[PDB]
Design a protein around this nucleic acid. Structure first.
Ligand SMILES: [Mg+2]
Ligand SMILES: [Mg+2]
Ligand SMILES: [Mg+2]
Ligand SMILES: [Mg+2]
Ligand SMILES: [Mg+2]
Ligand SMILES: [Mg+2]
Ligand SMILES: [Mg+2]
Ligand SMILES: [Mg+2]
Ligand SMILES: [Mg+2]
Ligand SMILES: [Mg+2]
Ligand SMILES: [Mg+2]
Ligand SMILES: [Mg+2]
Ligand SMILES: [Mg+2]
Ligand SMILES: [Mg+2]
Ligand SMILES: [Mg+2]
Ligand SMILES: [Mg+2]
Ligand SMILES: [Mg+2]
Ligand SMILES: [Mg+2]
Ligand SMILES: [Mg+2]
Ligand SMILES: [Mg+2]
Ligand SMILES: [Mg+2]
Ligand SMILES: [Mg+2]
Ligand SMILES: [Mg+2]
Ligand SMILES: [Mg+2]
Ligand SMILES: [Mg+2]
Ligand SMILES: [Mg+2]
Ligand SMILES: [Mg+2]
Ligand SMILES: [Mg+2]
Ligand SMILES: [Mg+2]
Ligand SMILES: [Mg+2]
Ligand SMILES: [Mg+2]
Ligand SMILES: [Mg+2]
Ligand SMILES: [Mg+2]
Ligand SMILES: [Mg+2]
Ligand SMILES: [Mg+2]
Ligand SMILES: [Mg+2]
Ligand SMILES: [Mg+2]
Ligand SMILES: [Mg+2]
Ligand SMILES: [Mg+2]
Ligand SMILES: [Mg+2]
Ligand SMILES: [Mg+2]
Ligand SMILES: [Mg+2]
Ligand SMILES: [Mg+2]
Ligand SMILES: [Mg+2]
Ligand SMILES: [Mg+2]
Ligand SMILES: [Mg+2]
Ligand SMILES: [Mg+2]
Ligand SMILES: [Mg+2]
Ligand SMILES: [Mg+2]
Ligand SMILES: [Mg+2]
Ligand SMILES: [Mg+2]
Ligand SMILES: [Mg+2]
Ligand SMILES: [Mg+2]
Ligand SMILES: [Mg+2]
Ligand SMILES: [Mg+2]
Ligand SMILES: [Mg+2]
Ligand SMILES: [Mg+2]
Ligand SMILES: [Mg+2]
Ligand SMILES: [Mg+2]
Ligand SMILES: [Mg+2]
Ligand SMILES: [Mg+2]
Ligand SMILES: [Mg+2]
Lengths: 108, 71
RNA sequence: ACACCAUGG
RNA sequence: CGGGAAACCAAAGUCUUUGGGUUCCGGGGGGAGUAUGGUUGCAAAGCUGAAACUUAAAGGAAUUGACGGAAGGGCACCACCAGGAGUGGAGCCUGCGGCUUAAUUUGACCAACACGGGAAACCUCACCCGGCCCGGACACGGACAGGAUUGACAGAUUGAUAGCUCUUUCUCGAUUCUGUGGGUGGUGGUGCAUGGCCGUUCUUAGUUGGUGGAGCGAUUUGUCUGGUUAAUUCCGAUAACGAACGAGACUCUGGCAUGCUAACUAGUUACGCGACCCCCGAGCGGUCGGCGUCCCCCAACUUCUUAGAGGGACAAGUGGCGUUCAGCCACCCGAGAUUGAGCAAUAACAGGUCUGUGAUGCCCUUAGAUGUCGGGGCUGCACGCGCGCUACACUGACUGGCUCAGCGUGUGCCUACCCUACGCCGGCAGGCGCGGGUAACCCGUUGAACCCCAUUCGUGAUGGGGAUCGGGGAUUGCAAUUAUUCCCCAUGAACGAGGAAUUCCCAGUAAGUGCGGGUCAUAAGCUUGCGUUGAUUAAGUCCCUGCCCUUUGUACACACCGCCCG
RNA sequence: CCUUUAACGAGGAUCCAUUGGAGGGCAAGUCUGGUCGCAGCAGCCGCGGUAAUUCCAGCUCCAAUAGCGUAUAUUAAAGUU
RNA sequence: AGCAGAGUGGCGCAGCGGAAGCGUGCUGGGCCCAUAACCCAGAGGUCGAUGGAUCGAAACCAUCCUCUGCUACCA
């Protein structure tokens, strides 16, 4: 959306992108619905819904709309909470679907 | 400008086959020399360099683009 | 002797 | 007077030099005038009235900006008015998005999109797919003169005649090679780490300090009520005086000199001429004349050409309007009474550029390279957008005839190529042969196009238009397929003046028209300059979009693209 | 126990001083590695998003010192009863 | 089963014989720094089916079918 905002790091888009997979204590998820205060309802691609929080690094720099693939890092002590670490675009989401990463219950 | 991936064959160079230094002459007697391979009749060559004993071929390493005898 | 004119990564 | 944070106040004064008498009442912002108890009232409601919890500020006066669907005065065809040509609609060219792909390299979103001189066949070249190379200084250590190390013929192998690798074994000679450190290169990353340059705010009139004055201070005056100007240009007024920058002045350019300087690398005239030609005139045809980029002059000159020095315009003269000041309008004289550009301030922007640089910090890679050769791409096509070229015909198309320019460039050092006359050959593009020019000398008196004068067409998507496509011929080049460019016969699409919107422009200007430079072995629908024909409409305003100055309001200051309530 | 006393009892490597901090308030480093809005720090203002003076450590330095830090009650600062 | 009304652009509809549009939805442009509002253009039709009259119809007539409202409600 256009604005007088020529300031700030101007343009962070490219036709190249490289995949990032899961790690220790780190799962995928699908955004169930949007809440306020930067919070979010999600759903891990296997079990719990695990309400999530958009971390300080992603705030207003990479937007997250409802019903998209995301990579969240689970908390050890708590269970129902997690922090949104990365977002997966449509092509990369379908790529993960091809590599068999996500149990194909949610589609793009 | 991206990194290289694992190859299939990569190998750099031959290893300069280590033949013995010099055994191109034999004596019938001390001061009666014999020569196994012929010296090359070339003008640029100083008539002191030898030829390969390459039966079906005769190859002078100095003239590296010509003067090969086929028998 | 006065039509409409809301909002902001 | 004195007080106060100040706005302001003869009281809000007589206050750290603190005490005339007395009642009510406040203690950071919310929760909240809420819950609960009491009391009053017919009701609505009044009076009294907490706490848990929460938070680093809420708030007051004044200052400087920015903003206002606030007011006053001005201003700009990147604003309008009156108009012109249009663009948006059509075909094609070119750039950007999207899609597709091994890759379709990438920057930039008024102030991106014919912009990066970015018209890419190779190269360029950063992308994709393969293949050689080291051009890895230097230090140390290791091996090494029956010897480190180099290069290569033949068959296989490979796009390849890369000894690349493999079989085989000649040749070179301390230059290498191995290992550890360390360098080196990079059109690799970051323009939000930078220099420099450029663009833009911002084409307008704006900016700043020294001493003095006002305020506790941020700040303010100087820098202005008013008139004037294109202008913070001047006149004046004056708690300011004297100054600096920008404007102006300045430089190039266009208009004028029958005055000066002086010219076969420029000309004129004259006749010396001489010659051709025609009577075209008196005449005979001769003499006199008429045409000449036909030939000469150690003829005379500088009008036309060239280029130097000076001159010339100053609102100077005259009439109105002006506090008779600064200045404005009109007119005579005149080549002209208002040519066009270059240069340009303080402060700033996370504007663009690491892909102009042997400018550059840090990070990355560095021999299986992100430092070279062959092949493909940057041009791929359901679609969206930008700058443009050609048209929609009779104020025209076609075919002949006639007659006029100006700004330029031209033989290259590495780098190998320049501009062409004239003869011949070919329908044409083009070929062969011989000359001139390093240039006011040759192409060249630059026979340019539109325009001018006559033919054929006749309102019919037609002889308008020239897309798309078939077949053939040339040139440049190492190589033309995905047609480089050019020529010839043929095929003959949309398009009958363009919706909502929107761009540029005041006089030799808009528009029509062709010609040079840039890139260029080949090549402009681009851009940068030049001439040629040459209008309609204005002499205004602040309505729309913005800009400048003053007064005013503000809960804004990341500055209205702000803040903020349920 | 102290005091008085014999005999042993020190070379600094042990007969080895700690507790807090080094942006400001507030005395003391823009030293070097690691992390990269995470971990954490921070009474308050505030530090951390790949060149951290504040985080984790090493070195150096500052304060009081056989003591120093923290939670709470309370007094002065408070002319904020 | 019956009465009445209707059958037209994806959807609501207008259209008293000289014959296809309106309002909404859909897609693309415009306007704006940008989004909504607003402006423009485009796409999409067996006028329910079958015959007949008429010089000619989507319209008039006849038969059938399909929706909606209301009673009938019916071995
Ligand atoms: Mg608005
Ligand atoms: Mg809203
Ligand atoms: Mg809101
Ligand atoms: Mg905002
Ligand atoms: Mg009183
Ligand atoms: Mg008193
Ligand atoms: Mg209170
Ligand atoms: Mg009360
Ligand atoms: Mg009560
Ligand atoms: Mg805070
Ligand atoms: Mg205020
Ligand atoms: Mg103010
Ligand atoms: Mg006004
Ligand atoms: Mg004007
Ligand atoms: Mg107009
Ligand atoms: Mg046109
Ligand atoms: Mg072309
Ligand atoms: Mg492309
Ligand atoms: Mg501008
Ligand atoms: Mg080309
Ligand atoms: Mg190429
Ligand atoms: Mg370097
Ligand atoms: Mg470089
Ligand atoms: Mg910049
Ligand atoms: Mg810069
Ligand atoms: Mg002063
Ligand atoms: Mg003072
Ligand atoms: Mg001032
Ligand atoms: Mg004026
Ligand atoms: Mg004066
Ligand atoms: Mg002065
Ligand atoms: Mg006068
Ligand atoms: Mg005159
Ligand atoms: Mg001028
Ligand atoms: Mg300036
Ligand atoms: Mg640069
Ligand atoms: Mg750099
Ligand atoms: Mg470039
Ligand atoms: Mg090279
Ligand atoms: Mg290549
Ligand atoms: Mg291109
Ligand atoms: Mg342009
Ligand atoms: Mg034309
Ligand atoms: Mg041109
Ligand atoms: Mg040329
Ligand atoms: Mg050219
Ligand atoms: Mg260009
Ligand atoms: Mg405009
Ligand atoms: Mg002004
Ligand atoms: Mg004000
Ligand atoms: Mg504020
Ligand atoms: Mg607003
Ligand atoms: Mg809200
Ligand atoms: Mg005791
Ligand atoms: Mg310590
Ligand atoms: Mg500490
Ligand atoms: Mg430390
Ligand atoms: Mg401190
Ligand atoms: Mg200190
Ligand atoms: Mg670090
Ligand atoms: Mg550090
Ligand atoms: Mg106390």
């Amino acid at each position: 959306g256009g604005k007088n905002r020529r300031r700030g790091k101007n343009e962070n888009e490219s036709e190249k992108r490289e995949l990032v997979f899961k790690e220790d204590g780190q799962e995928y998820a699908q955004v169930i619905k949007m809440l306020g205060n930067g919070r979010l309802e999600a759903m891990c691609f296997d079990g719990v819904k695990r309400l999530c929080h958009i971390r300080g690094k992603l705030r207003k720099k990479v937007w997250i709309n409802t019903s998209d693939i995301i990579l969240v890092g689970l908390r050890d002590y708590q269970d129902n909470k997690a922090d949104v670490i990365l977002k997966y675009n449509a092509d990369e989401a379908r790529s993960l679907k091809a590599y068999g990463e996500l149990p194909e219950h949610a589609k793009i | 400008k991206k990194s290289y991936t694992t190859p299939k064959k990569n190998k750099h160079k031959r290893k300069k086959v280590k033949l013995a230094v010099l055994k191109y002459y034999k004596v019938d007697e001390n001061g009666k020399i014999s020569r196994l391979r012929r010296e090359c009749p070339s003008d640029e060559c100083g008539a002191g360099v030898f030829m390969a004993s390459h039966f079906d071929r005769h190859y002078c390493g100095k003239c590296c683009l010509t003067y090969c005898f086929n028998k």
